[PDB]
């Protein structure tokens, strides 16, 4: 269920 | 919701290797940390050296918690790796960005239906040329292995003309041919 896009991961930095 | 951390599908373990404790390979492994949220990943990433600033002979490995970063693990012994081989100049231009993209592929569950086949990834900092690899659990699952390779190549932004290879760990450990190519 838990999938993150590249975009999403970088935003969370 | 703001106050909730963003959980990862898997808990991950980051390992460090440097050949300065033992003449046996595995006794040079150090567990650095484990994490299971996006926020905790970045906190760890922010604290540790870039791969390009490590001494030659060092490795980082990121593996699903419960899988040791070695051939002998039950989940690696029948498996293999997609190998990215870097030239010396790519330490500067590509190593750090390729490693980070690899980490994001893993923690984000970026291999859709075949994400469970992924075990981990390893970066080797070496004087002869650095290597990055994604380790998968079963070298005979053509469909899973090829899909993972194609995702990985696309996420690193490598053109069709650049070909990468997959080697089984059994072959790598024997005194290497590609099983697959993408
Ligand atoms: C990943 N490794 C690496 N390794 C030992 O470390 C040696 C070097 O492997 P490496 O660090 O993957 O590659 P590298 O240093 O570039 O050398 P090479 O030219 O063999 O690729 C291996 O030949 C082996 O003796 C291992 N030994 C055991 N028992 N299990 C493992 O999973 C591994």
């Amino acid at each position: 269920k838990k999938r993150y896009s590249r975009l999403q991961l970088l935003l969370f930095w | 919701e703001h106050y909730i951390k963003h959980p990862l599908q898997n808990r991950w373990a980051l390992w460090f290797f440097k050949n300065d404790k033992s003449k046996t390979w595995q006794a040079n492994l150090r567990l650095i940390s484990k994490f299971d949220t996006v926020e905790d990943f970045w906190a760890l990433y922010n604290h540790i050296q870039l791969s390009s600033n490590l001494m030659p002979g060092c490795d980082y490995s990121l593996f699903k918690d419960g899988i040791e970063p070695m051939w002998e693990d039950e989940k690696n012994k029948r498996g293999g790796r997609w190998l990215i081989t870097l030239n010396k100049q790519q330490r500067r231009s590509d190593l750090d960005r390729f490693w980070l993209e690899t980490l994001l592929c893993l923690i984000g569950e970026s291999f859709d239906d075949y994400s469970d086949d992924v075990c981990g990834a390893v970066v080797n900092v070496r004087a002869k040329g650095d290597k990055i690899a994604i380790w998968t659990t079963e070298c005979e699952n053509r469909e899973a292995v090829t899909h993972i390779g194609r995702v990985y190549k696309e996420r690193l932004g490598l053109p069709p003309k650049i070909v990468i290879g997959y080697q089984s760990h059994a072959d790598t450990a024997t005194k290497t041919k590609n099983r697959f190519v993408v």
Side-chain angles (χ1 to χ4, degrees), chain A residues 1-6 8-10 12-13, chain B residues 1-127 129-176 178-182:
Chain A
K1 79 283 196 183
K2 298 292 161 195
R3 299 161 69 198
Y4 298 93
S5 67
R6 183 179 174 278
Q8 276 186 292
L9 294 170
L10 294 175
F12 288 146
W13 199 353
Chain B
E1 199 57 276
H2 192 258
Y3 62 81
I4 302 167
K5 292 196 215 153
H6 298 85
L8 302 175
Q9 185 58 40
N10 290 289
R11 179 172 292 129
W12 297 88
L14 186 69
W15 299 80
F16 178 70
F17 179 97
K18 187 168 168 149
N19 198 17
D20 68 348
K21 301 219 300 201
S22 177
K23 295 189 186 162
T24 68
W25 178 85
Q26 68 202 121
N28 295 301
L29 287 163
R30 288 85 136 164
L31 176 64
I32 298 177
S33 195
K34 301 180 185 185
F35 59 88
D36 65 7
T37 70
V38 178
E39 288 80 6
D40 293 317
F41 166 72
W42 287 121
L44 180 59
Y45 186 80
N46 290 340
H47 283 82
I48 67 186
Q49 293 285 357
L50 290 175
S51 295
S52 63
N53 209 45
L54 295 177
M55 288 297 286
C58 292
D59 311 325
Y60 287 129
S61 309
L62 191 78
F63 276 71
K64 290 175 179 172
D65 190 27
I67 307 179
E68 298 204 305
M70 60 184 78
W71 301 324
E72 290 88 345
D73 197 276
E74 187 66 11
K75 296 307 301 252
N76 300 322
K77 67 194 300 188
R78 290 173 247 92
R81 64 181 182 175
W82 281 109
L83 184 58
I84 309 302
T85 55
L86 281 72
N87 61 49
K88 293 194 194 184
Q89 285 285 333
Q90 283 177 289
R91 182 166 301 161
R92 169 172 170 270
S93 59
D94 296 334
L95 177 66
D96 295 331
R97 67 200 196 78
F98 280 8
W99 180 237
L100 183 52
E101 293 293 338
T102 303
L103 296 168
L104 302 187
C105 285
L106 289 197
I107 73 182
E109 302 295 314
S110 303
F111 306 94
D112 54 77
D113 294 351
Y114 310 96
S115 296
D116 291 357
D117 269 60
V118 177
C119 300
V122 179
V123 52
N124 308 120
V125 183
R126 297 292 183 280
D130 305 321
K131 293 173 278 183
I132 301 165
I134 291 189
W135 285 32
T136 81
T137 201
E138 178 54 72
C139 66
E140 299 188 340
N141 193 336
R142 180 180 211 89
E143 190 175 297
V145 172
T146 51
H147 189 86
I148 289 159
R150 289 195 172 94
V151 166
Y152 192 32
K153 188 166 159 180
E154 201 269 356
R155 290 287 294 260
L156 296 171
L158 308 181
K161 63 232 290 290
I162 297 180
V163 172
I164 65 172
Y166 182 93
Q167 309 90 48
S168 82
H169 296 314
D171 292 345
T172 302
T174 53
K175 296 293 212 82
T176 308
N178 296 314
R179 300 301 190 78
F180 311 101
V181 144
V182 295

